[PDB]
Amino acid sequence: RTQTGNNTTVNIIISTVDYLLRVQESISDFYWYYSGKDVIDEQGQRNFSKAIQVAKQVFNTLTEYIQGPCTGNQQSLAHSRLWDAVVGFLHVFAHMQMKLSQDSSQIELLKELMDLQKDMVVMLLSMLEGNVVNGTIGKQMVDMLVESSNNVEMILKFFDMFLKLKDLTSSDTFKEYDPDGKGVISKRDFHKA
Amino acid sequence: QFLRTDDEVVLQCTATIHKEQQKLCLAAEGFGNRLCFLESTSNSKNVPPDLSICTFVLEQSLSVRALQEMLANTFMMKTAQGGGHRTLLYGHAILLRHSYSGMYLCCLSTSRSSTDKLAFDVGLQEDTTGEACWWTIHPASKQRSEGEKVRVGDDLILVSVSSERYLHLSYLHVDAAFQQTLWSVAPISSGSEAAQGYLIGGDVLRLLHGECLTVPSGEHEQRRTVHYEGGAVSVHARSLWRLETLRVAWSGSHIRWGQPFRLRHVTTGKYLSLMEDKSLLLMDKEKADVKSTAFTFRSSKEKRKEVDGMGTSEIKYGDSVCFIQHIGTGLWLTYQSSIQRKAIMHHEGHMDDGLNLSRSQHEESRTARVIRSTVFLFNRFIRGLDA
Amino acid sequence: NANVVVRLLIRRPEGLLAAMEEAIKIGNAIMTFYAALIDLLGRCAEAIRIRSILRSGDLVGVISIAFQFCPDHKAAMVLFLDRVYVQDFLLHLLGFLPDLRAAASLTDMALALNRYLCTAVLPLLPLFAGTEHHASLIDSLLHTVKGCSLTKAQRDSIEVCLLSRPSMMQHLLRRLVFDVPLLNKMPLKLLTNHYERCWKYYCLPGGASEEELHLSRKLFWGIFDALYEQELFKLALPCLSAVAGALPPNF
């Protein structure tokens, strides 16, 4: 955070916050490029997965930056400018998930971005603890999550419709509805039940 | 602290005309002029400029790729697209709207200047369709970044998206050249702004007795007398009053007590010029000094300075009574005595100063400034054909 | 690269056009410099949104170099006007009048003459000036009657003749008949083989000078009694005789 002993201070955490911000902005740019064509090409796959690995590594740093709950680092990064990139990644998540789900071959990159979401909320949960009761950090958490709150609809629809997917596909009129008891169910009859 | 949707601001230059900071702001005319022009605020003490023909509303804020996606859909604007209120970052593309007209800022294809070739001019079209009404924002400071928040008070650069030209300060004109020009953004009225039934600076409104404060009708003097009148003169046009403070920034804040009040009468365009040597009178724009006409309001008859925000919702409309104190004289508006009841600025006033205050509506002002726009056009017409 | 360069040049170009047309008397490097500028800017075809900025009133330079050291400048202007930007406004510029004038004047001229052959391929995309243009084209083809580039010139000439009105085309066909019957040299032979196809196109719609056309057909049959390129010209001369049938149905 500071290097007390040296003359000129260097706050290396704010620099890599800015680096994540630039990474996020260019990931958003990649999204706007593929936002129209929507059949994602293998070169864009192979490039963008590597970019997701980059983002995963830097979120792993940001976890282990504040994984020890040292409060000066909390006060620094909570004040810091990363919160735009939070909202931007959430936008990226919600708007990628749709076409990643709708396409067969894109499940690998869906696994990648899924994993990035996992590390995203790991980092958020890590920095989301140091609260007496409310905290100005807690204020800012809730406020910018509410500022995010359009795409949250999409990710919760995504989660519940892949969740009670798994729940209802053992229910009353599925498991016997196939003749084999195996899942050779016709998809229109699947829609119907 | 920053800028979002509906944060209505101004765009003002500080030209160095003869090595003096000519703080001229951009005047959007409309309703008789598709162009734009400038408006000085240097002699704001004595030649008070208008605010209402100068402001713009931050309508929308999107990235380049999102805008080109909107262009790819050749309404509903993708349901916002964006926020929320979409807090401004540099490199966003924006829509601006002259709030009085309903026009939108566009680049021209014409050559209505010098010209000084292929570098276009400034227009105010109707509809945001096409590319002409979109504006990239760039920091005019390498110290500050693109992608971070647009601060209060940033001299920056605005470039088109259709013509992709630098919005330049010509000579005194404004054009889409290839050369840059700083542009100041001051939070006038923002945001949101603020709640209804509240006295907001920079607002056209009436002036009720409890009966109004009237001007003489058509064919009068140049209408310079000031009287009371009862009845439906509220519904009549000439009972309208626009407030101005001495504040340029945060001029569209709330109206709190004891602050300056530059009473521009609407339908004349004139000012409520207290010449307390004689009485409460009416004079033009170039007359209007501070100590000539700027007033302060007290809650009582007996008798702050500055906040850099909206301020408190100080005075309502219904259960609210103000009392008019001039700064330089301390007078108080009472009357004297076919209701042509002459109102005077007096050291004491009666109990008959219990003014009630009512606002106006949008279409009322949309008629009102159009009225004298028409008048000052056809006075030129009359004088030219009399010549 | 077009987009990047054009944006950086709108940033600093550094009136230039009007006073650029001055120093022909006077130093040639600035003239060729602005020629290089317009040649560079002519190398670019959304992109339409900056094609507007390409489009952002150079016809002063176009007309000023359309007829007036020289041959690089008008070629650069031709490239610019062709790439950035009907047919009668296009033929308003009649540029090639001085070229077809000084064509037969037998080395900067020798540069410009085989230079502006490929220029004349770019206008391949009913009054008297069209007839004078066809006459000047026949005169420059007579200056061609280099040679491999003159083959492209003759293909452009045949295409411009087949573009059309037909009365001005017949006024030019008067000159074609009065010239080609003498050489029946190989360039005029292929030119008459093309004019036979033009008369075959205008035969059924066009059915004084028809008697001259019949006399030219009989003269071509008589010159065909003298027996290559003349073999193909005589093969198309059957189309000339059929066009005489269906149409009537160096100086």
Side-chain angles (χ1 to χ4, degrees), chain A, chain B residues 1-64 66-85 87-116 119-141 143-221 223-275 278-302 304-387, chain C residues 1-48 50-95 98 102-104 107-127 129-130 135 147 153 166 181 187 205-208 222 226 236 238 242 244-246 248-249 251:
Chain A
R1 194 182 306 113
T2 176
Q3 275 188 348
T4 64
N6 282 319
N7 291 318
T8 62
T9 185
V10 170
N11 207 163
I12 194 68
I13 302 170
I14 307 172
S15 65
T16 180
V17 163
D18 288 329
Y19 177 63
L20 180 137
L21 191 273
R22 188 180 300 116
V23 167
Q24 179 267 328
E25 288 187 354
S26 192
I27 292 300
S28 174
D29 296 328
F30 186 81
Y31 171 68
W32 286 110
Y33 182 72
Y34 274 172
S35 59
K37 299 179 294 300
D38 305 333
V39 180
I40 288 171
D41 296 332
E42 191 270 331
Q43 292 296 320
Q45 293 172 358
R46 188 178 182 273
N47 208 165
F48 183 62
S49 65
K50 191 184 292 181
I52 295 303
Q53 296 171 355
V54 174
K56 181 186 183 295
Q57 181 58 252
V58 67
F59 272 99
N60 288 312
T61 65
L62 290 169
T63 58
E64 297 295 330
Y65 286 156
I66 321 170
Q67 200 66 50
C70 57
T71 181
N73 194 0
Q74 301 171 356
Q75 289 297 110
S76 177
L77 195 141
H79 178 76
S80 299
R81 199 181 55 82
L82 86 159
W83 293 103
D84 292 333
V86 175
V87 183
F89 273 116
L90 292 174
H91 179 276
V92 166
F93 290 159
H95 293 282
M96 280 303 293
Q97 279 175 351
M98 308 301 288
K99 60 176 71 175
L100 290 174
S101 175
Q102 293 303 108
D103 303 337
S104 66
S105 177
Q106 301 309 114
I107 55 170
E108 298 293 324
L109 197 144
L110 188 272
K111 184 183 293 295
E112 296 292 326
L113 188 141
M114 177 175 72
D115 183 72
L116 187 60
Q117 292 172 353
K118 186 265 299 296
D119 200 0
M120 170 67 204
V121 298
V122 163
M123 183 266 175
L124 198 58
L125 279 170
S126 65
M127 68 179 296
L128 254 53
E129 51 86 22
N131 304 111
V132 176
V133 175
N134 306 114
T136 63
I137 181 171
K139 300 282 183 290
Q140 184 268 121
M141 291 168 196
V142 174
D143 288 330
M144 292 180 182
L145 263 297
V146 168
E147 287 181 352
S148 303
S149 180
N150 291 321
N151 52 10
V152 180
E153 297 288 334
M154 289 67 164
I155 63 174
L156 291 175
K157 286 179 183 179
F158 182 81
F159 288 158
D160 284 327
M161 292 168 187
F162 285 177
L163 182 272
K164 62 192 181 297
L165 188 150
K166 304 190 268 77
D167 301 331
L168 286 172
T169 52
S170 179
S171 62
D172 298 333
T173 176
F174 279 165
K175 57 182 289 295
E176 85 285 16
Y177 191 80
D178 50 351
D180 199 5
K182 195 261 189 295
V184 197
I185 177 171
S186 296
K187 191 169 74 174
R188 289 180 180 96
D189 294 332
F190 171 74
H191 167 266
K192 177 174 64 64
Chain B
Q1 186 62 257
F2 291 102
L3 305 177
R4 291 179 182 88
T5 308
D6 304 331
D7 292 339
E8 181 172 1
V9 295
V10 294
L11 292 174
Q12 182 176 6
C13 290
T14 60
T16 61
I17 294 173
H18 298 288
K19 292 180 174 65
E20 293 178 353
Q21 295 301 109
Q22 187 58 255
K23 290 178 68 67
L24 47 88
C25 67
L26 179 62
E29 182 68 30
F31 289 146
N33 203 166
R34 305 280 74 76
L35 294 173
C36 296
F37 64 100
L38 297 173
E39 180 67 32
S40 68
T41 60
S42 296
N43 196 3
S44 65
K45 298 173 262 72
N46 306 116
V47 185
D50 191 2
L51 185 66
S52 67
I53 50 97
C54 297
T55 63
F56 295 100
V57 182
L58 297 173
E59 294 289 327
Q60 192 172 359
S61 177
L62 288 177
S63 71
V64 175
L67 183 137
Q68 292 174 356
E69 189 273 332
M70 180 64 203
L71 266 60
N73 203 168
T74 62
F75 294 102
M76 192 59 209
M77 65 186 178
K78 288 90 174 66
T79 67
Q81 189 178 3
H85 288 175
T87 306
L88 270 68
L89 308 178
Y90 298 97
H92 290 176
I94 60 166
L95 178 63
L96 288 176
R97 180 174 180 177
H98 178 67
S99 66
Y100 174 67
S101 65
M103 298 296 173
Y104 295 96
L105 179 64
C106 67
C107 179
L108 287 176
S109 66
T110 68
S111 66
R112 297 177 67 187
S113 67
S114 67
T115 79
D116 192 77
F120 290 94
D121 300 334
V122 179
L124 291 173
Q125 68 175 359
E126 299 293 331
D127 297 332
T128 185
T129 59
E131 300 180 356
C133 290
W134 294 102
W135 291 100
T136 65
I137 300 169
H138 293 86
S141 295
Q143 295 84 15
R144 296 186 183 182
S145 174
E146 180 180 357
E148 61 94 17
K149 292 182 184 293
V150 178
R151 282 82 182 271
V152 171
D154 301 336
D155 285 330
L156 55 92
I157 303 303
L158 295 171
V159 184
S160 166
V161 182
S162 61
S163 70
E164 296 176 355
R165 289 180 167 86
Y166 289 91
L167 197 147
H168 183 265
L169 182 63
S170 175
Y171 290 98
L172 298 177
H173 300 288
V174 182
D175 53 352
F178 292 163
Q179 298 174 356
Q180 289 189 356
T181 291
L182 296 178
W183 283 98
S184 64
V185 174
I188 308 302
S189 63
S190 64
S192 69
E193 196 260 332
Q196 296 182 358
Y198 289 148
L199 272 175
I200 299 167
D203 186 74
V204 176
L205 42 87
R206 274 82 175 274
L207 183 55
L208 298 176
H209 180 77
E211 185 176 0
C212 179
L213 184 70
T214 190
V215 182
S217 68
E219 297 176 353
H220 295 291
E221 292 183 354
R223 288 177 181 265
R224 295 183 186 275
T225 65
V226 170
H227 303 282
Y228 278 168
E229 182 180 358
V233 74
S234 65
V235 183
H236 302 167
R238 54 182 169 88
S239 66
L240 288 175
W241 296 97
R242 181 169 177 81
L243 286 162
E244 287 188 352
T245 65
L246 288 171
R247 290 177 291 172
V248 176
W250 291 106
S251 179
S253 66
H254 294 93
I255 297 171
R256 303 182 73 187
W257 298 104
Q259 69 188 2
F261 294 108
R262 294 182 294 180
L263 277 171
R264 186 257 183 87
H265 181 78
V266 178
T267 60
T268 61
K270 286 183 182 176
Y271 284 88
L272 188 62
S273 65
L274 177 57
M275 190 174 178
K278 297 179 176 66
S279 68
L280 185 63
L281 296 175
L282 292 172
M283 288 298 293
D284 292 331
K285 295 189 178 182
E286 297 178 353
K287 182 261 185 296
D289 302 335
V290 177
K291 61 185 179 181
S292 72
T293 186
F295 294 155
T296 56
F297 289 165
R298 299 291 191 271
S299 66
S300 67
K301 184 60 67 67
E302 179 182 3
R304 294 181 181 178
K305 300 179 181 68
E306 287 177 354
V307 286
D308 290 332
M310 283 303 295
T312 63
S313 70
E314 188 74 34
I315 308 168
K316 295 180 67 64
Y317 285 95
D319 294 332
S320 297
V321 172
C322 298
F323 293 97
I324 304 169
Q325 183 176 2
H326 179 64
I327 301 168
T329 64
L331 296 174
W332 301 91
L333 181 67
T334 184
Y335 61 85
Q336 288 179 354
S337 65
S338 67
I339 302 169
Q340 197 177 2
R341 186 178 297 169
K342 174 178 171 64
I344 58 160
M345 289 291 289
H346 176 69
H347 295 278
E348 294 84 3
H350 302 289
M351 196 59 70
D352 296 330
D353 304 342
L355 301 172
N356 196 0
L357 289 174
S358 67
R359 62 179 296 163
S360 62
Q361 296 175 359
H362 301 282
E363 55 89 18
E364 306 179 0
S365 176
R366 282 177 290 175
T367 55
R369 183 69 171 84
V370 160
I371 292 167
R372 94 293 323 275
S373 176
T374 301
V375 169
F376 291 119
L377 183 139
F378 288 111
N379 290 322
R380 297 181 185 179
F381 182 77
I382 283 164
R383 293 176 184 177
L385 270 75
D386 289 332
Chain C
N1 304 122
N3 190 5
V4 175
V5 166
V6 165
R7 291 176 63 191
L8 295 176
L9 287 175
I10 297 302
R11 192 161 299 171
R12 277 97 67 188
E14 183 173 359
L16 291 170
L17 175 61
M20 185 273 294
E21 300 169 353
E22 178 187 4
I24 302 99
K25 302 174 184 178
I26 298 167
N28 199 4
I30 304 300
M31 188 69 198
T32 62
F33 166 74
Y34 283 98
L37 186 144
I38 194 66
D39 196 2
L40 175 62
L41 294 176
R43 297 295 178 90
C44 54
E46 201 178 2
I48 305 167
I50 68 169
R51 180 174 173 83
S52 64
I53 306 167
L54 276 69
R55 191 165 292 163
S56 296
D58 300 330
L59 304 176
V60 178
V62 172
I63 299 168
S64 67
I65 314 169
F67 287 101
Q68 290 177 358
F69 174 71
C70 291
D72 52 348
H73 313 299
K74 175 178 171 66
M77 292 296 173
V78 160
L79 287 176
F80 177 74
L81 190 67
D82 185 76
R83 295 294 299 273
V84 183
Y85 314 109
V86 173
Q87 287 186 356
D88 296 332
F89 172 70
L90 189 144
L91 293 171
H92 162 71
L93 294 175
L94 297 171
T107 186
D108 295 329
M109 298 175 72
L111 292 172
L113 62 88
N114 288 316
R115 184 181 300 274
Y116 287 91
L117 297 179
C118 69
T119 294
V121 185
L122 291 179
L124 288 178
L125 280 74
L127 55 94
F251 185 75

